[PDB]
């Protein structure tokens, strides 16, 4: 009833080779079946090389799905995708711990420690865990990149039920959008970071609004679009309309009218996930299978 490790590898190979490009239409099929592969690994209590390889490439497929579903207008809500991606990252982390305890090594560990650092980008638990790993994992360029993103995303004014604000956070939104455009940024990591575009933009406009005097003119949409890297004007107009930011002159945002202090409005659903044009352009220049194979 259950697949041994080598045919789980054969099955994931089948998926990477045949069904990646059926996305976005095959998103539910692929997510369910990949989850079935991981479940077959748990059925046999197997944390061997096949489980590592499968969970790794499955994580990458989740990261690709995050961008594909959002570029199109198919699904909107990526709750299950982020949940199974996170659980797969937890599995990979535990297996990395057991392999290190046994004296072995995993060549792709650093990459998925970075992804793990991006799964819960405001949870200090993952900083705690990343600080006790070996120096070659910690100083790896991917882990360094994820750490930089965790620093620039930190915000002392981040508001959400159950989240304790921490001191002296950076809220470096400008640096965030500078790093998102970096050609050295791995594409799948970017796909993971696109999940926080709306939050980072909201707290950027909030923090900026607190610095403007009462009679300050509305901020033009050009400045906010270059500052927050909006794909087009319709996106910043829908953004202001979502957070009830008054649009004056059809091209300016009156930031003092922003009455919300939390990115998550109490009653309405979150604004649909968005993407960056640079990362989509980078996706059209490579292949899905290439990204999934590292």
């Amino acid at each position: 009833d259950v697949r041994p490790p080598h045919i789980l590898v054969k099955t994931l190979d089948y998926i990477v080779d045949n069904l990646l490009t059926t996305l976005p239409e095959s998103e539910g099929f692929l997510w369910d079946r990949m989850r079935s592969i991981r479940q077959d690994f748990t059925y046999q209590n197997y944390s061997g090389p096949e489980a590592v390889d499968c969970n790794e490439r499955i994580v990458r497929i989740h990261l690709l799905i995050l961008h594909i579903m959002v570029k199109s207008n198919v699904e909107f809500s990526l709750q299950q995708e982020l949940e199974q991606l996170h659980k797969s990252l937890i599995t990979l982390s535990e297996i990395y711990d057991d392999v290190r305890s046994s004296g072995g090594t995993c060549p792709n560990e650093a990459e998925f420690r970075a992804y793990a650092l991006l799964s819960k980008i405001r949870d200090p638990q993952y900083d705690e865990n990343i600080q006790r790993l070996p120096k070659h994992i910690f100083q790896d360029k991917l882990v360094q990149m994820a750490l930089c993103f965790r620093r620039v995303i930190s915000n002392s004014a981040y508001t959400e039920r159950g989240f304790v604000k921490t001191e002296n956070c950076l809220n470096f939104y400008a640096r965030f959008f500078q790093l998102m455009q970096s050609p050295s940024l791995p594409l799948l990591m970017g796909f993971f970071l696109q999940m926080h575009l709306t939050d980072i933009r909201f707290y950027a406009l909030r923090a900026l609004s607190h610095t403007l005097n009462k009679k300050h003119k509305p901020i033009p949409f050009i400045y906010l679009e270059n500052m927050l890297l909006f794909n087009n004007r319709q996106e910043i107009i829908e953004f202001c309309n979502y957070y009830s930011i008054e649009i004056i002159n059809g091209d300016a945002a009156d930031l003092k009218t922003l009455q919300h202090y939390s990115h998550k409005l109490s009653e309405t659903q979150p604004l649909k996930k968005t993407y960056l044009t640079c990362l989509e352009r980078r996706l059209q220049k490579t292949t899905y299978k290439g990204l999934i194979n590292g």
Partner: protein, 455 residues
């Protein structure tokens, strides 16, 4: 003379003088007991405990005695691993004799339990270091000990609101002791978040009306571990009051031992960076006996860089000190939270001469961009460092308005921003503290910590 019968008399009457796993204190008696107990099977030892006169009619107590007889019979002093099953089994039985508040000889068993707890913690570390050769997972022994001490901790109940006596039951006497032992275990196994429950249920279980009524050393260690926990969750003020009160309480202790000086050093290793994040700098006078001159020089270099607004200085200091800062979980929080203080002092020195001395009320973004060109120095975009680093990827002199906006939002700079004018307006005044208030007061007012005196 039958030494097993004798030991069973002593244990049956609460005399636990020879009830210990430490062979450095029990070696000869345990050897005699081992020679006399050879021959008898497990059921015969169990019968020896069951039918012994004056033996308390407690199943867990008799299980403890029988487990100690099995230990004494089968112990191999030449092999700590071969004897580990007997040792840990007996330890678990001994702690099991403490779960019931009215267990037989509970008050006499508590000191035995603390003693054996220290012993079994040392042995658990020793055996955990050989986890690869023993085919065990990392920290398995010590984690088992943590589970045992956790059940013991859960068994300790709060005082009855209308208690009939002032008796401090021995389970309450070792409450803070058990808290610090368990939390220390959680730190050594590198899972310190498990301290959460232990920190949440400590005060509700305590019968003492004031936290200062415990032994002051246990208070110091508790504030040390709680501050380290808070700092693990990036709660800098909450950690700071704990480190500060810990070091003060340590200053009150008479300097009997060198280990007290090293403990004070352990406190300072966290209190200095935590304070520096909150805009506080120590006076090295009362810290001379606890810190070497080189450590003082290091933190003094960082003190200069933060004091005069040198971001590149701060990042260089963190880069050179990266390893030991990561070992003490200090690199990330400093890398994240020192910059805003350093910026605050930078624009402090800028606004001082520009506004209070030169009488210019306006701060053009170009001026602050040149100042940031001097302070930040090189960035990821700049040539000569083509790979991104936590020390060159975060701070850029192009983001003038962002730095100003975070300074104003943190309450460190009282000013208005004009993005379309590209300038920052402060209040026309000669007093610099009206524009840039004291940083520690602002931070502590925005982030009020919990009561430094717990209760």
């Amino acid at each position: 003379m039958d030494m097993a019968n004798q030991l069973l008399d002593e244990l049956a009457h609460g005399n636990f003088s020879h009830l210990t796993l430490n062979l450095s204190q029990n070696g000869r008696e345990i050897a005699i007991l081992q020679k006399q107990l050879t021959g008898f099977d497990d059921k015969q030892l169990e019968t020896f405990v069951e039918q012994h006169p004056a033996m308390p009619n407690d199943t867990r107590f008799k299980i403890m005695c029988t487990s100690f007889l099995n230990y004494a019979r089968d112990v191999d002093p030449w092999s700590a691993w071969s004897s580990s099953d007997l040792i840990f089994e007996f330890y678990q039985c001994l702690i099991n004799c403490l779960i019931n508040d009215n267990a037989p000889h509970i008050e006499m068993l508590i000191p035995v339990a603390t003693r054996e707890t220290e012993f079994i913690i040392n042995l658990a570390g020793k055996l955990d270091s050989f986890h690869l050769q023993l085919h065990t997972r990392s920290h398995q022994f010590l984690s088992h000990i943590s589970s045992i001490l956790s059940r013991l901790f859960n068994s300790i109940k709060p005082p009855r609101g209308n208690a009939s006596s002032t008796n401090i039951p021995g389970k309450q006497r070792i409450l803070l002791y058990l808290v610090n032992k368990l939390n220390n275990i959680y730190f050594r196994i590198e899972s310190p978040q498990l301290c959460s429950n232990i920190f949440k249920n400590f005060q509700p279980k305590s019968m003492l009306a004031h936290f200062n009524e415990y032994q002051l050393d246990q208070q110091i260690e508790y504030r040390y571990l709680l501050g380290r926990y808070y700092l693990l969750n990036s709660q800098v003020h909450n950690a700071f009051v704990q480190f500060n009160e810990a070091f003060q309480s340590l200053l009150n202790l008479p300097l009997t031992n060198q280990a007290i000086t090293r403990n004070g050093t352990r406190i300072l290793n966290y209190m200095i960076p935590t304070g520096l994040i909150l805009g506080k700098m120590v006076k090295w006078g009362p810290l001379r006996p606890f810190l070497s001159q080189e450590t003082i020089d290091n933190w003094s270099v960082l003190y200069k860089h933060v004091r005069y607004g040198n971001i590149q200085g701060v990042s260089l200091w963190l880069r050179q000190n990266e390893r030991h800062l990561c070992a003490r979980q200090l690199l990330i929080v400093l890398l994240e939270k020192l910059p805003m203080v350093t910026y605050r002092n930078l624009i402090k020195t800028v606004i001082k001469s520009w506004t209070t001395e030169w009488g210019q009320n306006k701060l053009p973004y170009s001026l602050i961009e040149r100042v940031l060109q001097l302070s930040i120095g090189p960035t990821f975009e700049d040539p000569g460092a083509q790979e991104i680093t936590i020390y060159n990827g975060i701070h850029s002199p192009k983001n003038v308005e962002n730095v100003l906006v975070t300074l104003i939002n943190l309450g460190l700079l009282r000013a208005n921003c004009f993005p379309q004018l590209q300038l920052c307006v402060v209040k026309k005044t000669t007093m610099i503290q009206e524009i840039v208030p004291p940083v520690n007061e602002r931070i502590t007012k925005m982030f009020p910590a919990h009561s430094h005196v717990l209760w």
